């Protein structure tokens, strides 16, 4: 009687079948009823006009057309949903039917393989830009119809992914391209009318909880299997340079959203994290290495030659390949001792992509061969997010081990790169991604202060040449993020230096006081570059981190001024005359904060003022 209840029945019975290989006396009983009830409930003669007065051209759409068009088995959808205002159950009911016939005939679908070829009784679901501002119940009809047919097709690709016949694989791949086209059409219909949501979630948890594109991608649509990623085995055929790029984008975007949700969703959540990463180790690595190398060979020719949309899809395909590797190896179950053999098999694959024969190697040797293979992709990367995911991947694989030099060199290589300035391409160089890469680079460098002198020797010619530098991703816009990460890593390096004692040797005394001297001179050059740039957030971030620098200088330099005063008088007077210039500069910056009356800046003025009075009275105390 109730559609959600029939759906729940079908779902829960289906869960019973998938989970439990019971003695099929009941399943051989019920399946003979369920196949018949299916083939009378939805299956009609493939007559392109169904009965019903629709304001919609109803056809037998999204057929494979390699079969005979004048056929029997088609599936009635729009006359069912119109008669409601049975089809809400179609996904789970087919799931049940699929599972029972797989239990009966032992994976033999010789009765059904006509259903993968079948056209579907649908309206023309076309870009209806001509049918705009008629945001009535018909748009809910269309949005719900595309939702159901996508869910239907997702349940078909769940069904026929296990079958190894090549024609069936081709039929599945034609269905995958159909899926991504109808996904862009549905997110377009939600861009046409946003409040028009079709409420059809899965039933274990989501339906008891109540009773835009990211909600539907996981929770509202039918959840795919992991055996569906047996399709990504097929080789890439790159449509721009000469299984296609968008039909691989779909599977990789699915596996990404699966492993991110699970490791850091009904069908997936009944499997352990361990079995998921275990089966992904076989169904990613020795088959996606080929796709990664073919992609390297594609972006090598995209560099050698130099239409837009196939390169845009392949860039995102590269991003997803590296994001899968990052999510795979940043799994927190490899800290556990049982899984290191699996890590030894995984790193055996990444070492084996240059040379084989080095079996039962030491761990850091496999890391060296693996990272030597992986580093050389930095030239084939087309946007910044993929570069960010490659550097973080290399970080979290070499964290098992000296390694600082590799990360520092590669982060410098990515900051030095062109990054071709398409508007959406420079939009992939967004401020938070850059912040993450520069915190990686400035933390992993040999000397934080010398790296800050490199950036403050290249951050000042942004004004002289470009009204974009000799070190790109450095504009007047990106100056704010470079400045914030620069002074932030300056604070992280400077809070770590400990004051010794007067009993401490003269060598360690001289080296840490000259470290304080280069720290205060780096603070002077960081503060002195404010006067030429305006921009409210830049002066806010330096009035924040200026104060936290001078407080670090109060807590952790003034004890060294107390300890080494009798012996190192020339050094401490050089330190104090160096700090007095930035004290007067910070006085001027607080004055600049008062004169404009900026509300965001003038919260942090009085603490800065009283700390400058505390440091000058401390300087009077040290001189006496």
From Swiss-Prot:
It is linked to Fanconi anemia complementation group D2: A disorder affecting all bone marrow elements and resulting in anemia, leukopenia and thrombopenia. It is associated with cardiac, renal and limb malformations, dermal pigmentary changes, and a predisposition to the development of malignancies. At the cellular level it is associated with hypersensitivity to DNA-damaging agents, chromosomal instability (increased chromosome breakage) and defective DNA repair. Highly expressed in germinal center cells of the spleen, tonsil, and reactive lymph nodes, and in the proliferating basal layer of squamous epithelium of tonsil, esophagus, oropharynx, larynx and cervix. Expressed in cytotrophoblastic cells of the placenta and exocrine cells of the pancreas (at protein level). Highly expressed in testis, where expression is restricted to maturing spermatocytes. Belongs to the Fanconi anemia protein FANCD2 family. Required for maintenance of chromosomal stability. Promotes accurate and efficient pairing of homologs during meiosis. Involved in the repair of DNA double-strand breaks, both by homologous recombination and single-strand annealing. The FANCI-FANCD2 complex binds and scans double-stranded DNA (dsDNA) for DNA damage; this complex stalls at DNA junctions between double-stranded DNA and single-stranded DNA. May participate in S phase and G2 phase checkpoint activation upon DNA damage. The modification Phosphoserine is found at residue 505. It is found in: Nucleus. The gene is FANCD2. This is Fanconi anemia group D2 protein. It comes from the Eukaryota. The C-terminal 24 residues of isoform 2 are required for its function. Homodimer; cannot be ubiquitinated and does not bind DNA. Part of a FANCI-FANCD2 heterodimeric complex that binds and scans dsDNA for DNA damage. Interacts directly with FANCE and FANCI. Interacts with USP1 and MEN1. The ubiquitinated form specifically interacts with BRCA1 and BLM. Both the nonubiquitinated and the monoubiquitinated forms interact with BRCA2; this interaction is mediated by phosphorylated FANCG and the complex also includes XCCR3. The ubiquitinated form specifically interacts with MTMR15/FAN1 (via UBZ-type zinc finger), leading to recruit MTMR15/FAN1 to sites of DNA damage. Deubiquitinated by USP1 as cells enter G2/M, or once DNA repair is completed. Monoubiquitination requires the joint intervention of the FANC core complex, including FANCA, FANCB, FANCC, FANCE, FANCF, FANCG, and FANCM, and proteins involved in cell cycle checkpoints and DNA repair, including RPA1, ATR, CHEK1 and BRCA1, and is mediated by FANCL/PHF9. Monoubiquitination prevents DNA release from the FANCI-FANCD2 complex.
């Amino acid at each position: 009687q109730s559609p959600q209840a029939s759906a729940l029945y079908y779902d829960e019975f289906a869960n019973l079948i998938q989970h439990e290989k019971l003695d099929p006396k009941a399943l051989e009983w019920v399946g003979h009823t369920i196949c018949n009830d299916f083939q009378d409930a939805f299956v009609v003669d493939s007559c392109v006009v169904p009965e019903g007065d629709f304001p919609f051209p109803v056809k037998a759409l999204y057929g494979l057309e390699e079969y005979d068009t004048q056929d029997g088995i088609a599936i009635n959808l729009l006359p069912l949903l119109f008669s409601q205002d049975s089809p809400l159950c179609l996904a789970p009911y087919f799931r049940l039917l699929r599972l029972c016939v797989e239990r009966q005939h032992n994976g033999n679908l010789e009765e059904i393989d006509g259903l993968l070829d079948c056209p579907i009784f649908l309206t023309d679901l076309e870009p209806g830009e001509k049918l705009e501002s008629m945001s009535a119940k018909e748009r809910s009809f269309m949005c719900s119809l595309i939702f159901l047919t996508l869910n239907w097709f997702r349940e078909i690709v769940n069904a026929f992914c296990q079958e190894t016949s090549p024609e069936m694989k081709g039929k599945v791949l034609t269905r995958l391209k159909h899926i991504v086209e109808l996904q862009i059409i549905l997110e377009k219909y939600l861009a046409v009318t946003p409040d028009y949501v079709p409420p059809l979630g899965n039933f274990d948890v989501e339906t008891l909880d109540i009773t835009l594109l990211l909600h539907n991608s996981h929770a509202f649509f039918r959840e795919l299997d992991i055996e569906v990623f047996s399709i990504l085995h097929c080789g890439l055929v790159t449509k721009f340079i000469l299984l296609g790029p968008p039909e691989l984008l779909f599977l990789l975007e699915d596996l990404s959203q699966k492993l991110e949700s699970m490791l850091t969703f009904s069908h997936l959540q009944q499997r352990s994290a361990q079995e998921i990463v275990h089966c992904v180790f076989q169904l990613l690595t020795p088959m996606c290495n080929h796709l990664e190398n073919i992609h390297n060979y594609f972006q090598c020719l995209a560099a050698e030659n130099h239409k837009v949309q196939e390169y845009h899809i392949m860039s995102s395909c590269y991003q997803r390949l590296l994001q899968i590797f990052h999510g795979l190896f940043a799994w927190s179950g490899f800290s556990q001792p049982e899984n290191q053999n699996l890590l030894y098999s995984a790193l055996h694959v990444l070492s084996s992509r240059l040379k084989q024969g080095e079996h039962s190697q030491p761990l850091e040797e496999l890391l060296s061969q693996s990272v030597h293979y992986l580093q050389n992709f930095h030239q084939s990367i087309p946007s910044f997010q993929c570069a960010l995911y490659l550097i973080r991947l290399l970080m979290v694989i070499l964290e098992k081990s000296q390694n600082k030099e590799k990360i520092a060199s590669l982060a410098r290589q990515f900051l030095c790169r062109v990054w071709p300035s398409g508007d959406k391409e420079k939009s992939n160089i967004s401020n938070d991604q850059l912040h993450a890469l520069l915190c990686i680079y400035l933390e992993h460098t040999e000397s934080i202060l010398k790296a800050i002198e490199e950036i403050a020797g290249v951050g000042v010619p942004e004004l002289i040449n470009s009204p974009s530098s000799t070190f790109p991703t450095l504009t007047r816009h990106t100056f704010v993020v470079f400045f914030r990460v620069m002074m932030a890593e300056l604070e992280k390096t400077v809070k770590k230096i400990e004051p010794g004692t007067a009993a401490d040797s003269q060598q360690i005394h001289e080296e840490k006081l000259l470290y304080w001297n280069m720290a205060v001179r780096d603070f002077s050059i960081l503060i002195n570059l404010i006067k030429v740039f305006d921009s409210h957030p830049v002066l806010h971030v330096c009035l924040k981190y200026g104060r936290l620098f001078v407080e670090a200088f109060l807590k952790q330099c003034m004890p060294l001024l107390d300890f080494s005063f009798r012996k190192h008088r020339e050094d401490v007077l050089s330190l104090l005359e160096t700090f007095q210039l930035d004290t007067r500069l910070l006085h001027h910056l607080c004055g600049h904060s008062k004169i404009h009356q900026d509300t965001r800046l003038t919260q942090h003025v009085p603490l800065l003022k009283k700390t400058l009075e505390l440091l000058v009275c401390r300087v009077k105390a040290m001189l006496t």
